[PDB]
Structure formats: C-alpha cells, structure tokens
Amino acid sequence: ADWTGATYQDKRYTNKYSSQFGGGSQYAYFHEEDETSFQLVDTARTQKTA
Amino acid sequence: MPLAKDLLHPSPEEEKRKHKKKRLVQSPNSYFMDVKCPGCYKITTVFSHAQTVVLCVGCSTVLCQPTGGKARLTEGCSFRRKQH
Amino acid sequence: VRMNVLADALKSINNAEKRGKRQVLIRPCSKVIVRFLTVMMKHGYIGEFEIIDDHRAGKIVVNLTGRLNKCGVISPRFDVQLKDLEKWQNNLLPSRQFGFIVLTTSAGIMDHEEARRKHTGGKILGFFF
Amino acid sequence: GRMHAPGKGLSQSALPYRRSVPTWLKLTSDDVKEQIYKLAKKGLTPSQIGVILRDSHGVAQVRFVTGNKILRILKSKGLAPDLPEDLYHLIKKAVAVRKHLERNRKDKDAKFRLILIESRIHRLARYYKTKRVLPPNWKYESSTASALVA
Amino acid sequence: VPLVKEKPKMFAKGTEITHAVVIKKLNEILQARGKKGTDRAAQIELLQLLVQIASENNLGEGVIVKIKFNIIASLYDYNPNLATYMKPEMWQKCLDCINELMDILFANPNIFVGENILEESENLQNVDQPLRVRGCILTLVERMDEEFTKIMQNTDPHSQEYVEHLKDEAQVCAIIERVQRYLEEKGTTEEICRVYLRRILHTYYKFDYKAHQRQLTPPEGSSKSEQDQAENEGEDSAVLMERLCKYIYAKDRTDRIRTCAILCHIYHHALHSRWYQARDLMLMSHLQDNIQHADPPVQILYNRTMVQLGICAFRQGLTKDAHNALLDIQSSGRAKELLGQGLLLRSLQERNQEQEKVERRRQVPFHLHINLELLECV
Amino acid sequence: SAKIVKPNGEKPDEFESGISQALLELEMNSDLKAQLRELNITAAKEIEVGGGRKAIIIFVPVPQLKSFQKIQVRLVRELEKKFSGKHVVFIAQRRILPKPTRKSRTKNKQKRPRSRTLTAVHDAILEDLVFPSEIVGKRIRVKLDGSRLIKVHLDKAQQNNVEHKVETFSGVYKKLTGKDVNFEFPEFQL
C-alpha cells in the first residue's frame, strides 16, 4: 500500500500483482470524503533549527 | 489621492482590502469549511465564525469555541471553503 | 436619515469637478437621478455614465469634463405655471442665452425650454449651467 | 446613529450578490422545515433558530432553501408566540432594573437608564399596534409588565 | 458573616425534587456545555451531585441512565483539544462511570437505548411501555477506544508508564464484551457489526497462549475438579474471530467494516501460523487492486497484514513467498511510515507541519508495532 | 401527444410540431427515461443571429421549469446532435401584466404581484440563458444616444460551457426584450 505513488512508477512492475480474473471490488473500500479539504491549522509558531 | 484614479475596475486585493460595505459589491469575509477529523469520523460542515459550540457525536463532544470573531478549531484538520 | 437623495448627490459632482477629477461615485442611486443626468448629458456637460447594480439600491459612476460649472438643487419643490417661469429663470441663471432650469411635468422630466413648447407647467427640481 | 446613546458604529452583516444554493447542500425545502419545528419546541426563538442552522448545518440561510422567512414558517402552523421576542427582551430587562431600584434607591444611574428603556418600549408598541399586530387597547404599565414577561 | 462555604446549592431549601425539575436542571447544565467561559470541572461535579440527588429520591432509572450518559460525554469534553489524550485520574473515572452504567443497564432489560430514539420519544416515566432513553453506548465505547488509542500514542514506548497504561487494556476488553452481549440481545444489525469490529480490533494481534498451552498439554491422565473445566470452556480467540467475521460478511451494509474485518481475520490466521487460510482469504478478497482507493488507516492495516503474511510464510519455510510479500515494503526505504510506526527523520525536512500532525495521529500504538529489525532480518 | 402539447400557443404549426414529436419520443424511449419523466412544452420558436445561424427556443409551463434545470446539459447535449446545426437553450414563459397605476384599465381585480411585474421577468429570463454560470455581477452603461448596453460579469469557472454559446445567447434576449446585452468574463473571481 503506497500512499505516495512512488514505489510503482516503473512500467516493468505495473502488472506484477494484477489478478488473472481482474481484481473484484467486493472487498474494496472507497473513501467518499475529499481529503483535499482537511488543512491542519498549525498555529504556526512551530520551529526547527536552520 | 492622485485625483485621477480609476474606480470602475479595482485591483484584486490592493483595492479589495477595504471594509466590506465600502466595496463596489458587498461581499462577506467569511467562509464555510468541510471537516472530518478522527474524534468524530463524519464529514461535518461548519461556519468559520462559529458563534456557538459545535458538538461531536464521536468520543469527543466539542470541535469549536466561539471567540471574538473567527472560531478557534481544535486538533482536527478538515478544511475547505469550497468556492465561497 | 438622507431626507432628499438628489440634493446630496449633486454636491459631490459639484465638489469633485472643482478639485479636478473625472470619475466619481454617487449613491444611493434613485431613478430620479438617472433621468436628470440624461438631460444634462444631451446638452453636453457630462459624458457617458455607468450604473453599477446592487440589490440594495445600486451605485452610479460618471465621467465628466470641465464644461460644467455647477449644478444645484432647489428644494422644496415649488410649482410653475408658465408666467411664474420668467421670474424663476432670471434669479437662477447667469444669462438668458444659456443655462437650463430642469423640472418635471406630466409629460416627463425635461428642461424648461421644452416645457414651454408643450404648454406644461409642473414642479421644479434643480438647475445647472 | 444610536437612538439613546451618542455613538455611531458599523458592524452590519453583508450578504453576497449571488443566491443559488449554492450547489453544495442538501435537505430539500421540506427537510429544513421539520429541522426547524423541533427547535421551537425547545424554546429556541427565531433569531436563535437561524444561528443554530447556519453554524453547524449546511444552510447559508433559510430564505434561499425556502421561499419564506423563518418566522412565517412557524406562523403558518399557528405555533408563533403572541408577541415578538423583540418586545419581550425589552420588557425582560426592565423588570430586573426595577428590582435593583427597589433594593437600592441611591442608584440614580439605573433610574436614568430605565427612562430610556421604558420610552423605547412605548415607541416600539406604537409600531405594532397601528399595524394590527397588537390589540388597540393594550398598554404598558408595571402590572402588565410583570404578568406578560412570566 | 456571609455564609461560607457550602458548594453553591443546586436547589433552594424548599424546592420539591420532582422528575420534571431534575430534567429542567439537566437541560440547563447541558445548555451550558461547550460555551466559551464555563468551567468543565464544575460541569462534571454538578452532574455527579445531580446523580446523588436522583439516587436519594429514586426518580426513575431512565433519568439515572440519561445523566450517566451526560457524565461520560462531559468527561470526553473535559479535554477541549480532540488531538490530546485524557489524564489518568479522569480516564479511571470514565471507565468506572461506564461500568456503573452497564451494571444498571444489565439489571434492567426493560430499557431500550439508542441513537434512533428522538428526544420527543423519551419514555422516562411509563412502567407499562418500554423505557426509551436517547443515548448510544456504542458511540461512547468507540470514543473510549479513541481516547485509549491517544493515551497509547502519547506515552513513551520505553517508560514504565507504558506498561501501567497497558494494564487498563484488560478493562477496555471487558467493557467491550459487556457491550457486545448487551447488543446481541437488543441491538440493530448495524450497531452489532460495529461492536464486532471493535472486539475484533483488540483480539486480532494477541497471540492465544491459552490455545497453544491447550495444544502443548494433551490430556493424559490427572483427575481434578469439574469446576476447573467450566473456566477452561473459554471460547477460543480463533472461533470467536471466525464467528464475528462471518456475521460481518453476511450482514454488513458498509464496505469499510467488511474490509477491516477481512484484514484482521487474515492477520489473526497469519499470527497463528495458519498460512493456507490467510493466503486463500487474501486472494479471495482481491484487495491488492482496490486498496489504493481505501482510507490511509485501512492501507496501514493492509500493509501490517501483508508483513504478517510474509512472516507467516517464513515460519512455514516458504522463503520464496515470504521474500515476494516483503520485497515492495522493504525496498521502498519507507517501511516505518507504511506500517504507521513513526516518521523517518530524513523526510522531516520535506513535509508541512500540518500533514506531519495528521500522520502522527495515524500512528499505531507501540504494542501494535512489528519490529522493523525483525522484518529486515526475515 | 405531439400536437396538443403546445396549448396557448396554437397547436398547428409545422416546425413546432416536428420538434414536439421527436422530443417526447426521446422521453418515451428506454435509452434515457430514468431522468426524463414525460414533461411537455407549451410552445417553441426558432430565431436567428447576425452570426448567420439559427437557434431554437423551448418554452415550458413554469412550474415544470424547475425539473428541466435538473438535467439541462445531458438532455441539451443529445438534442444538440439530434436537431443538429442549431444551438439549443431552455427558457420560461410568463403572463406579464400592464400596471393598474395605468397602462391598461383596472377593476380592483387584485393587487398585481411584483413577481408578475414586467421588470422582474426580464431579470428572470437572463438568469436562465446563462444558468450554468450563475451570474456573478451585472453592470450597465448608458450611451449619448440614450441607448443602454448591459454588461454581465459571469463566473470564471464553467467557461467553455457558455463560450461557444456566448454570442448566440445575446441574440435570444434581443428578440424577447428589445434590448442589447453583452457578456463578459471578469478580471478576477471572488
């Protein structure tokens, strides 16, 4: 499970884990909430050394 | 004033930083927001200046706090406008 | 309050023209102000003007030139009967030759020069020159 | 500006030009109505009602998801109160002032402020009563103030 | 002198303590909840003193249940920041108030409790009708598990305090069992499937040493007590897991609860060396294609289940299938993040503080970690 | 039907009948019928532009107008190809009233509502033509010849929905009112 999309960018591995029957959706969870609306309000004085 | 300035078409925020009823068209300076933290796993929608405590149905039972203007949220992100 | 809208309006465009400006903002937009400025535009004292729309009452913006010297209001609104006319226009105008007293009649809002050809008296509103 | 203070000030709400839905929303006209009726049972008065919808529910206002105001909806049922909350809140204040005034007769400041709030009732009453929203025989007195606020 | 200093008496000396006056006072206190200027310590004490007065006057158990619900809900509201944990002194008082609420609710089978009861349907007084109390034990226990999870995200993993707060996990597991039995008799199928998921969530990672001890002693010959047999009829964690999961698969209307249940079921088979069952459930699910669109906490559960499948294949000597299952996770260089066990310090330089504060809340507690050195060694 | 689905508008007329027949046919067809629910028109009309092209007009009873606004794009897309070579727009028809303050005689019949007034209708008509932009602003300019040109500031999203209809919408309004309008997209969006 790669939330960053970085691990499978190589076209050689895109089909390595494709099921012969086509992956059914009966056990697939679909998130209906648009996570693009959630902003962590950093009450912004958090700091790190240069 | 340079005494010749345009007033038909104003700058995006250098002549829309003015008071909201001194603009050409009256706009609010407030917005909604779509939330959905964890303490209460539901897609809630809340107004920016809450004015009242917004309750939660999860483990938590508080989300907001009404101050003297906008409203201090909490430890839950959930942000959008959207559009307005 | 803002008892009379038209009376507050003209003083802005009067003040603005003196300082040297060519765009203004006048509110809150009465229909009465529109037909006034229409007549005042034909003769040539001001240019084309843009009516901004709001639900509240609107706002109007004007483009103007130095041709105008002063437009005033006369309030409260007296009647004229086309023999009272000559007495009014003497006091209110710099000359017989030019200057335009405005008024409203049942035949609509117009200058005094037009009203005399329709045989219509009515209620006087303002003037300009 | 202010009608019994010398002050002047702006803090008025300003509505957008638009007025669609806007798009993003739910609870068809009918859904909003039953959402309201529950609140009025609990003693939430029309001003409070619109707040508690606007803050935590998806409405912008209940005038663009209905063709009526918040008050007219309640009035069509017959469940509206017999006097406006505006009048009620004036009378509600002035009784406590009169209590404090009986407990302390040397608070001339309170006595002064009572004259304002008193006269402001009578002016408001003369709006409604001419418009046939109150009986044309109703008056404001100490006795009628006591009973009508309870 | 001015009277001092009895705590401000909730009722005047001479108001008769009627059920309607207690509900009116409860609603006055509840209308004070969440307001910017109320003390929250006083709100809990004022509700506890209202319990004492309700028990001194036997004013109907429906009122006692309604005020206990409001106490537990005010104990969660004590912390105004949903992202911080509860203090231990308030946590214990919450577990106590939940046990006392369950004791009263088990004594009285006649009471119906739920979200689906409107406030206008609150039968608090009529003995001839089912008592209907608006309050949901499930959403309070789901919130108890969220507060426990936050304690175990904010205590240090290497301090003795972690072992102390882990003792309370047994009380949490017992409360969830009490609430399971109660909802099997009275609950809706959508509340039952949610409690079954919470009971699964505290059992799927625990290795059943009792089932293993029962396999290490075959019953060759010593005679003791039929009483020691009734306490040995403790239903196997495996049979309980299979029953609860099969009920979810047959009754669940949500693809989420089903997806969490199948992943916990596969993890529990994999933990118990039952590789064939864990493999055949994983393949039958087709989650490999679909998990990319599931929520990140379900992706963390899937990644932990895939590591546990690789470790299960390794324990069965299937070195090739173990290597294949672990290859993508370890070759990423991001295994700690993909498993929800922390952030890598080398990525701290590239992220927004708000995203970091959301990723920190998505971390699993340390007692749910799979050692990264064990993963890399395997 | 196909001829009596245009009442108060005169049932016979060739072009209007040929619209109705294939219109209701689509609604009756099983290809789409899960969002089409056997509504009818009340008239129709075809009007040109100075762009050298024709465009069709669809009137509705107006309480039914609301339901048309539901689908409105899918439906119009299908009928853009089915009646092709012309542009397609919905509009609504009102029974506009003279004033009792006097343009025709009153009998103290009723008050005259201010949604049944003239000016409110000419505002409402504009709202439908460019409905998917959800009009952001309105401005007007007045000419030295006493003419008026009506600027309309539209939303800066949903641009290409209206951008190939942009001129042809203006010619519609001309025929209904008698007025000249222009459409613009503004400098900035708030």
- The Cβ-side half-sphere exposure at E126, using a 13 Å CA radius, reads 10
How far is Cα F89 from Cα F113, in angstroms, rounded to an integer?
Answer: 28
Task: Please choose, from the candidates B61, B62, B36, B35, the residue with its C-alpha nearest in 3D space to the C-alpha of residue B48.
Answer: B35
CB-CB under 8 Å, F188 with B12: yes
The answer to whether A2 and E332 have CB atoms below 8 angstroms apart is: yes
Confirm or reject contact between B25 and chain F (CB < 8 A): yes
Tokens standing for residue F47: 């009007």
Same-domain check for residues C23 and C55: yes
Tokens standing for residue E171: 């009380």
Extents of the domains making up chain B? 1-84
Q: What is the dihedral of CA D122, D123, D125, D127, to 10 degrees?
A: 160
The data reach a resolution, in angstroms, of: 6.0
Surface-to-core class of residue D37, CB atoms within 10 Å of its CB (0-12 exposed, 13-18 middle, 19+ buried): middle
- How much is the CA Rg of chain D, to the nearest whole Å? 19
Extents of the domains making up chain F? 4-189
Same-domain check for residues C57 and C103: no
The answer to whether E339 and E370 have CB atoms below 8 angstroms apart is: yes
CA distances F145 to C22, D149, F177, F183, F184, Å, are 21, 64, 19, 21, 23
Between vectors from CA B59 to CA B53 and to CA B62, what angle results, nearest 5°?
A: 10
Task: Please choose, from the candidates F78, F8, F88, the residue with its C-alpha nearest in 3D space to the C-alpha of residue F46.
Answer: F88
Mutation choice for B interface testing from C52, C53, C60, C64 by most B CBs within 10 A: C52
To the nearest whole Å, the CA of E259 is away from the closest chain A CA by 6
Chains B and A touch (3+ CB pairs under 8 A): yes
According to the entry, how was the structure determined? cryo-EM
Confirm or reject contact between F137 and chain B (CB < 8 A): yes
Between vectors from CA E290 to CA E286 and to CA E292, what angle results, nearest 5°?
A: 140
- Asked whether the CA dihedral D115, D116, D118, D122 is positive or negative, the reply is positive
Tokens standing for residue C11: 């003083």
Bond from prior residue into D84 cis (ω within 30 degrees of 0): no
Same-domain check for residues C64 and C1: yes
Tokens standing for residue B54: 């917004």
CB-CB under 8 Å, F136 with D17: yes
- Asked whether the CA dihedral F171, F173, F174, F176 is positive or negative, the reply is positive
Confirm or reject contact between F187 and chain B (CB < 8 A): yes
Query: What is the separation, in whole angstroms, between the first and last Cα of chain C?
Result: 29
Chains C and E touch (3+ CB pairs under 8 A): no
The answer to whether B58 and E143 have CB atoms below 8 angstroms apart is: yes
Between vectors from CA F106 to CA F104 and to CA F108, what angle results, nearest 5°?
A: 165
Same-domain check for residues C51 and C104: no
Nearest chain F residue to D16, by CA: F136
Between vectors from CA B36 to CA B30 and to CA B40, what angle results, nearest 5°?
A: 125
Within 10 angstroms of residue F97's Cβ, the number of other Cβ atoms is 15
The answer to whether E221 and E173 have CB atoms below 8 angstroms apart is: no
How far is Cα E302 from Cα E310, in angstroms, rounded to an integer?
Answer: 12
How far is Cα E337 from Cα E342, in angstroms, rounded to an integer?
Answer: 6
Nearest chain B residue to A33, by CA: B43
DSSP C26: B
Confirm or reject contact between D24 and chain F (CB < 8 A): no
Same-domain check for residues C54 and C82: no
CB-CB under 8 Å, A37 with B82: yes
Surface-to-core class of residue C97, CB atoms within 10 Å of its CB (0-12 exposed, 13-18 middle, 19+ buried): exposed
How far is Cα E185 from Cα F105, in angstroms, rounded to an integer?
Answer: 76
Confirm or reject contact between B27 and chain F (CB < 8 A): yes
Tokens standing for residue E64: 């006692």
| CB < 8 Å to D20, chain F | 134
Same-domain check for residues C64 and C76: no
Ordered domains of chain D (ranges, CATH): 26-80 (no CATH), 81-149 (1.10.287.10)
- The Cβ-side half-sphere exposure at F168, using a 13 Å CA radius, reads 20
Domain end: C44, C68, C92, which one?
C68
Tokens standing for residue B62: 């508080």
Same-domain check for residues C64 and C74: no
Domain end: C42, C68, C94, which one?
C68
Tokens standing for residue E289: 């294609």
Return the CATH number at C79. 3.30.1490.10
Structural domain range at position C57: 1-68
CB-CB under 8 Å, C61 with B8: yes
Bond from prior residue into E5 cis (ω within 30 degrees of 0): yes
Angle (deg, nearest 10), helices E237-251 and E209-216: 130
How far is Cα D50 from Cα B52, in angstroms, rounded to an integer?
Answer: 12
Say which CATH topology domain B1-84 has: N-terminal domain of TfIIb (2.20.25)
Task: Please choose, from the candidates E348, B65, E357, the residue with its C-alpha nearest in 3D space to the C-alpha of residue A39.
Answer: E357
Tell me how far the alpha carbon of residue C9 is from its chain's centroid: 10
Confirm or reject contact between B8 and chain D (CB < 8 A): no
Nearest chain D residue to F155, by CA: D18
The answer to whether E19 and E124 have CB atoms below 8 angstroms apart is: yes
Please name the chains neighbouring B, where neighbouring means 3+ C-beta pairs under 8 angstroms: A, C, D, E, F
Q: Where are the beta strands (DSSP E) in E72-125?
A: 111-114
Domain end: C31, C52, C68, which one?
C68
Instruction: Count the domains in chain C.
Output: 2
Q: Identify the bridge partners of residue C124 per DSSP, sorted by sequence position.
A: C103
CB-CB under 8 Å, F187 with B12: yes
DSSP per residue, E299-350? HHHHHHHHHHHHHHHHHTT-HHHHHHHHHHHHHTS-HHHHTTS---GGGTTT
Confirm or reject contact between B16 and chain F (CB < 8 A): yes
| CB < 8 Å to A48, chain E | 348
Same-domain check for residues C115 and C79: yes
Same-domain check for residues C36 and C91: no
DSSP F184: B
Tokens standing for residue D127: 């709006």
Q: Where are the beta strands (DSSP E) in F76-182?
A: 87-90, 137-142, 148-153, 180-181
CA distances D62 to B81, E266, F67, F120, F127, Å, are 20, 50, 22, 22, 21
How far is Cα D5 from Cα E67, in angstroms, rounded to an integer?
Answer: 46
Binding residues of B for Zn(2+): 37, 40, 56, 59
